[PDB]
Amino acid sequence: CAGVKSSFDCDATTSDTCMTMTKANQLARDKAAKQAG
């Protein structure tokens, strides 16, 4: 095991959710409508 500390302290990573490219467009659109508000 290389000596230097071998761990990031972020934990959070991306999560492939196997969502169709197209459905992501709608997911982006309504969020823009609501998050901006």
Binding site: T14, S15, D16, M19, A24, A32
Partner: protein, 196 residues
């Protein structure tokens, strides 16, 4: 004054990765890259308490991989907009940061399980068989298979899976002036006309 305010270097806008791509993360990543596209979902936060509305514009990206940090280092290709009757299509330079860090965080995946296992096995046989010959004292096939299997296994290269639905932030690392297509078209005509 032009309709679009000057976009300065450093500005950032939130986004939703529409197209997910597999980042080639080997020694030749920045040459052999994979396309990927993100849509904007927020208002560009300009440097000093300034906000410009850019929602629904499409940004084309291009990305490779980096195994040391387990992140996908991406570079913006172009930005496209369709507001009112005016269409925007410009080349810009910028990067994308995820969770406060340049690049998008992802894992590293190897599809070498079976091939690497076979290599090990083939010669695990070869070596203990040399000891079996030491016992019977009073391999070529395994060697050839090991060589071929190593040659096949070395072909694979680490990949970073970056998918869709994730939330990222796009940064314009150099400032640019947002301009429309017909306006730029007219400019090109004026420059070509050679008004001496």
């Amino acid at each position: 004054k032009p309709r679009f305010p000057w976009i300065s270097s450093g500005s950032f806008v939130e986004a939703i990765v529409v197209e997910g791509a597999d980042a080639n993360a080997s020694v030749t990543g920045d040459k052999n890259t994979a396309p990927m596209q993100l849509r904007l979902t927020g208002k560009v936060q300009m440097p000093n308490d300034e906000e410009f509305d850019l929602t629904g514009c499409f940004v084309t990206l291009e990305a490779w991989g980096d195994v040391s940090s387990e992140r996908a280092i991406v570079r913006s290709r172009s930005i496209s907009c369709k507001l009112g009757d005016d269409d925007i299509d410009q080349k810009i330079a910028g990067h994308v940061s995820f969770m406060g860090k340049n690049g998008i965080k992802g894992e590293v995946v190897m599809r070498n399980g079976q091939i690497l296992l076979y290599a090990g096995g083939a010669g695990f046989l070869d070596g203990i068989g040399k000891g079996i010959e030491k016992a019977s004292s009073t391999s070529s096939a395994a060697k050839t298979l090991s060589d071929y299997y190593i040659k096949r296994a070395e072909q694979y290269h680490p990949v970073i899976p970056i998918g869709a639905g994730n939330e990222v932030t796009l940064v314009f690392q150099d400032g640019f002036q947002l301009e429309t297509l017909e306006e730029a078209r007219a400019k090109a005509a004026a420059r070509k006309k050679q008004n001496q």
